[PDB]
Amino acid sequence: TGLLDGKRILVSGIITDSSIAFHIARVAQEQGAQLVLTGFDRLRLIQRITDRLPAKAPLLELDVQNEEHLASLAGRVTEAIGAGNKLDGVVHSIGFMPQTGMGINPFFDAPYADVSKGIHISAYSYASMAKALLPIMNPGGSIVGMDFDPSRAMPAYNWMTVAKSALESVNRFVAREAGKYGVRSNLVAAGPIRTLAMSAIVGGALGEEAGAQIQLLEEGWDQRAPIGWNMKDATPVAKTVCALLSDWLPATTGDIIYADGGAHTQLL
Amino acid sequence: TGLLDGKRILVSGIITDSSIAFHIARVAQEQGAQLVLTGFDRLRLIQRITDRLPAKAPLLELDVQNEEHLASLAGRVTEAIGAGNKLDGVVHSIGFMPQTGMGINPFFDAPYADVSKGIHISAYSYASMAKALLPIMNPGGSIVGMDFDPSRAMPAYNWMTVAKSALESVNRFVAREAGKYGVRSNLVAAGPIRTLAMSAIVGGALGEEAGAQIQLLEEGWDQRAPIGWNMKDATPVAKTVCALLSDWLPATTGDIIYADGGAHTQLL
Amino acid sequence: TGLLDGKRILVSGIITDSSIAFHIARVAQEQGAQLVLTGFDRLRLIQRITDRLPAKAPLLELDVQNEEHLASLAGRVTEAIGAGNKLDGVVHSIGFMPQTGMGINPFFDAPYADVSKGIHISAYSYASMAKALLPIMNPGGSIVGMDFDPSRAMPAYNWMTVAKSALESVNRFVAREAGKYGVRSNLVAAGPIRTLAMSAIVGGALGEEAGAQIQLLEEGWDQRAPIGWNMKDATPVAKTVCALLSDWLPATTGDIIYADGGAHTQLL
Amino acid sequence: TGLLDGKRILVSGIITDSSIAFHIARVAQEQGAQLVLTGFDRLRLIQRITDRLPAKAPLLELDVQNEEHLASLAGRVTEAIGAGNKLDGVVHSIGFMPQTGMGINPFFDAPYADVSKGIHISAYSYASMAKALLPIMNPGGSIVGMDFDPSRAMPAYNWMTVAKSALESVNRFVAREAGKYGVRSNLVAAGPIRTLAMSAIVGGALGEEAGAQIQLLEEGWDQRAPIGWNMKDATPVAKTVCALLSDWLPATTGDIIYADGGAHTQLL
Ligand SMILES: NC(=O)c1ccc[n+]([C@@H]2O[C@H](COP(=O)([O-])OP(=O)(O)OC[C@H]3O[C@@H](n4cnc5c(N)ncnc54)[C@H](O)[C@@H]3O)[C@@H](O)[C@H]2O)c1
Ligand SMILES: NC(=O)c1ccc[n+]([C@@H]2O[C@H](COP(=O)([O-])OP(=O)(O)OC[C@H]3O[C@@H](n4cnc5c(N)ncnc54)[C@H](O)[C@@H]3O)[C@@H](O)[C@H]2O)c1
Ligand SMILES: NC(=O)c1ccc[n+]([C@@H]2O[C@H](COP(=O)([O-])OP(=O)(O)OC[C@H]3O[C@@H](n4cnc5c(N)ncnc54)[C@H](O)[C@@H]3O)[C@@H](O)[C@H]2O)c1
Ligand SMILES: NC(=O)c1ccc[n+]([C@@H]2O[C@H](COP(=O)([O-])OP(=O)(O)OC[C@H]3O[C@@H](n4cnc5c(N)ncnc54)[C@H](O)[C@@H]3O)[C@@H](O)[C@H]2O)c1
Ligand SMILES: Oc1cc(Cl)ccc1Oc1ccc(Cl)cc1Cl
Ligand SMILES: Oc1cc(Cl)ccc1Oc1ccc(Cl)cc1Cl
Ligand SMILES: Oc1cc(Cl)ccc1Oc1ccc(Cl)cc1Cl
Ligand SMILES: Oc1cc(Cl)ccc1Oc1ccc(Cl)cc1Cl
Ligand SMILES: Oc1cc(Cl)ccc1Oc1ccc(Cl)cc1Cl
Ligand SMILES: Oc1cc(Cl)ccc1Oc1ccc(Cl)cc1Cl
Numbered sequence A, B, C, D: 001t002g003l004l005d006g007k008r009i010l011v012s013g014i015i016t017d018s019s020i021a022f023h024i025a026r027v028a029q030e031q032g033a034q035l036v037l038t039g040f041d042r043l044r045l046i047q048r049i050t051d052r053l054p055a056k057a058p059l060l061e062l063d064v065q066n067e068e069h070l071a072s073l074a075g076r077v078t079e080a081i082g083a084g085n086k087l088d089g090v091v092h093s094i095g096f097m098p099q100t101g102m103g104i105n106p107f108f109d110a111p112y113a114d115v116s117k118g119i120h121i122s123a124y125s126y127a128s129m130a131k132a133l134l135p136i137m138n139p140g141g142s143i144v145g146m147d148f149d150p151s152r153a154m155p156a157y158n159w160m161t162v163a164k165s166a167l168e169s170v171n172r173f174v175a176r177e178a179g180k181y182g183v184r185s186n187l188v189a190a191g192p193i194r195t196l197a198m199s200a201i202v203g204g205a206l207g208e209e210a211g212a213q214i215q216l217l218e219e220g221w222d223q224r225a226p227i228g229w230n231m232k233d234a235t236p237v238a239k240t241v242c243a244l245l246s247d248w249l250p251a252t253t254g255d256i257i258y259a260d261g262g263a264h265t266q267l268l
Helices: A020-030 A043-049 A067-081 A112-133 A158-181 A209-224 A235-245 B020-030 B043-051 B067-081 B112-133 B158-181 B196-202 B210-224 B235-245 C020-030 C043-051 C067-081 C112-133 C158-181 C196-202 C210-224 C235-245 D020-030 D043-049 D067-081 D112-133 D158-181 D209-224 D235-245
Strands: A008-011 A034-039 A059-061 A087-092 A137-147 A183-190 A255-259 B007-011 B033-039 B059-061 B087-092 B137-147 B183-190 B256-259 C007-011 C033-039 C059-061 C087-092 C137-147 C183-190 C256-259 D008-011 D034-039 D059-061 D087-092 D137-147 D183-190 D255-259
Touching (some): A008 A020, A020 A034, A020 A235, A034 A067, A043 A059, A087 A235, A112 A158, A158 A183, A158 C158, A235 A255, B020 B033, B020 B235, B087 B112, B112 B158, B112 D112, B137 B158, B137 B235, B235 B256, C020 C033, C033 C067, C043 C059, C087 C112, C137 C235, D008 D020, D034 D067, D043 D059, D059 D067, D067 D112, D112 D158, D137 D158
Parallel strands (some): A137 A183, B007 B087, B033 B059, B137 B183, B183 B256, C007 C033, C087 C137, C137 C183, C183 C256, D008 D087, D087 D137, D137 D183, D183 D255
């Protein structure tokens, strides 16, 4: 086919070629889809990275803490894909949390401004991002954001866990909004993946103990995952997303798909 | 081209032109997949029904309560798709619970021996069928079974619920077995679909009030469903089965996918 | 004798004679527990309200958005229950979300800065309150907070839902912290209770159709509830909080207990 | 009090003084409650064990695979507690599975008769047990059975996992039945406990590998459990049950309480 053939999808979240958003972006192109991209803080420095990709993309500035960039989103996206033209997808592949809310830093010593910043970026934005892009989105289309399963507590994810719990809650509201448009809204709970927002994360060897709470993460997840799990390889999470963007899951919304190797279904 | 070009796939459970398996076989085929089919005791019935599929495909007896068929089955399947050629997909769309287990019939009056039969056919069969079909499956291959969200109580479903709770659990284990061969196990939790048997209960064959309980229950999927649910269109669900059978969710096994238009994620 | 003979217990959140905390303080007391109480900015209001409790008990200002109260609080609590005497129980019955976050107000139009306030007060406060009160707690002691089942979408609750999703997650971590001191953390997921603010929304202060949405939603707890649910009787819920504060669930922490008459376990 | 004061509760499942049912039985007596007991296969040999207990008990034969013993249950129980006298509780502390369905024995090599036997005993019976005893049970009373969390697959629990998934499904039906009587019905998902149906289980050193998948179980669960977990000590699971029998959780049914040290809420 080109499983995303002719489809016109925006893809947020890139900042290196180890970014998952990069990998969704790649696969979506391998597969048919004229793209539009967003980046946060040097674009300059990103365009170099989005170049590294098969086909090419209008790449627009977007800082999701900016009321001013969101108000315009819809504007700019129509410039760049043409007029009388709407989007068929959207990828929220964005997140962030102060070092304070994460790693060995005690849980109680994060002050709320720090956490607020996390939630806003990792949580709220899925909803701004849908408020801005649904008006220019077609029937039978799709939004996807990237989750990491927060049902259970764990060490190191600390307050990011709490943001991800809020993400899932948001996601199902946004589905209720999106469905007035014929749009689906779903997350992809992914298994762990080698991106430098991880070697931030616990990170940075804030440890030497942290060659460890990363090796043992990769062993952990591979052991539990009935089909095994490769932390060096985003393409299984990226193919799973293109699936949601696809029409082949036309009756799932409000929902969370786990591309984690079925590790979450096993206790050990 | 799209989804299944090349893939050989068993598909259980055809009994009517309206059976969920049938709409699975159809879509499988229109997506370039060559099949073997199974069916249970009304066999030349099944051949008339399966003649209305796009491609012909062979068809084999298979009552999952009988070991001489289970034993014999990889034998017969190999035989109808050619020696040293193996199966990339398998679909159990099978299920049964004596009427004693269901509707208006009091919950406490189902004899264990009716309940043991429904659990045999609806839940244990998924394993016994995996046991037998895994020797002729192929890496990156896919088994998918049919589910109804058993995770909470409801009118009518009664002890089919309890079987579906058993299946969700069998499936995790089956994944734990199937990963040995590079094979995913997964269920698809569908919304209600107006099969024949359901056109009959809506039409009053269980009584002029039994049919109302089922109707308010039934009817509130669409009301809950962010993108609606139409129970007289099985296509979204068959489309969902193909997604699992495809290479496009390779990091999910052990799990359940909700093809219920989103409703299981909303309260009202 | 029964439940709490001997136990010293803080209990947040009294604002009305109908507040869920109040019916908690009452039952705590009738069960032989000596208390300290907190409240927020309508302070001599709180003293008239708390005069109708069986025993007197002291009362302290505590707005959880302010650090000089949080800092100061174990100071003040120690002071009102006597030096080298510590707390066996703690109750957060606190919660707020601007009206922009709720009812008929469109989901996408709540400004992050309203959402960050509701999450501050409803969810982050549970940690910041544990941080401060754990130094003066005692082994086998108990913290319990108030929840509403946020695990799926619904009309009205909107972004309070998203906060409650955050709380369920904070609570797991707080347990992970509190176990350091032989202290359980747990939430109680209540059914709806006709507090004052809710007698007002049922009575139409959000509009002659906003009040209907809430009524069909509200009303179907009792219909779902295997043992009924009466929202103008907060006693079962206060009774439930005491169970947690008691020695009689010592192997449960991190968790949520559903005091909703069973309804969250049934579909219809 | 005697938190179960004056209360009249039947307690099934004893066969040694390491049985959990033994421990619930003890604590319920420590606490006020005239008991009635059931045992399975030498009673003879059990009465010696139920003697070991504080106060004393009518101890009745009950093999839950016997249509004949259930038909009589209600009869015998009224002989033994007097007439114009009903029960206020019931403890399903019973289970069983063929060696075949458990341990290193492959999952696929259990034949269905074996599993049927498991489900019947571990699953169905909660429901026969409520069908027989609700007719002689009072308003505001309670039934409890013992769960071990089956949401995730794991090794060794094999088909017992599947029975426990069916138990939870059953439990919420039985609650729907029980509530016509004012009766609650709930499970207690317990953490692991040293009982000789465990050193059956994997068991019997069917291993030497099995000093191990038991030490590592005890280490596992203690590590994850924010308040720590002692596998040599049933009393925390037993106090949790008496709690359900109590009136202090008067608004929970259909439900599952976890007395596992909050290990299930943590991933690690
Ligand atoms: N790394 C993993 O194993 C993993 C696993 C599961 C889920 N996730 C989630 O998947 C998503 C992708 O993360 P990733 O690991 O590819 O890391 P990444 O660092 O490559 O991506 C993070 C992105 O968020 C962007 N970002 C930060 N603030 C922004 C803002 N204010 N506005 C717009 N974009 C902003 C950054 O520019 C960056 O592109 C995130 O939600 C992450 O939490 C990651
Ligand atoms: N119909 C729905 O709305 C719905 C919703 C969710 C899940 N499901 C599930 O989908 C599956 C199919 O049901 P359907 O809707 O296609 O109804 P159906 O009646 O068309 O399918 C049932 C199949 O089970 C077969 N069967 C019973 N005993 C058998 C045996 N011993 N050996 C082989 N086959 C046997 C029937 O012959 C038929 O082929 C079942 O799992 C059902 O529980 C159906
Ligand atoms: N009412 C229900 O039907 C219901 C159901 C489930 C959960 N809950 C939860 O129970 C809790 C109590 O609500 P309620 O029903 O008792 O309503 P309420 O209005 O009586 O209680 C809210 C409390 O939060 C306080 N508050 C707000 N901001 C504060 C601050 N900065 N510092 C200290 N206190 C502050 C209020 O003053 C009051 O004391 C909340 O968690 C609520 O979300 C209520
Ligand atoms: N041992 C544990 O760590 C653990 C943990 C969680 C849950 N559980 C569950 O708690 C419950 C108590 O088990 P336990 O470990 O105390 O083991 P146990 O062997 O002491 O109790 C098992 C009981 O089931 C009874 N039983 C077997 N067949 C019976 C029948 N046909 N009719 C009536 N009774 C019958 C036996 O006589 C025995 O009393 C069971 O459901 C078990 O699965 C046990
Ligand atoms: O959520 C994640 C989960 C995993 Cl296992 C790995 C990376 C993840 O993503 C992040 C974690 C922390 C920050 Cl500050 C930013 C991002 Cl994107
Ligand atoms: O699981 C199901 C759920 C729904 Cl809502 C509708 C039909 C279903 O499927 C069955 C129900 C009862 C029997 Cl006897 C056989 C089957 Cl296939
Ligand atoms: O009718 C139903 C409707 C729903 Cl939504 C769920 C279960 C139902 O019950 C049945 C489904 C199939 C068969 Cl054959 C018999 C019965 Cl009673
Ligand atoms: O969480 C709740 C759930 C329900 Cl059904 C009813 C009341 C609740 O509590 C609140 C809702 C909104 C605000 Cl602003 C403050 C509080 Cl305390
Ligand atoms: O009204 C409600 C009823 C339910 Cl069952 C759940 C949430 C509701 O919404 C509210 C609860 C409290 C406040 Cl102050 C405002 C609103 Cl809109
Ligand atoms: O369910 C259990 C879980 C654990 Cl960790 C320990 C014991 C358990 O209980 C049983 C396990 C197997 C058999 Cl054959 C009988 C029983 Cl009572």
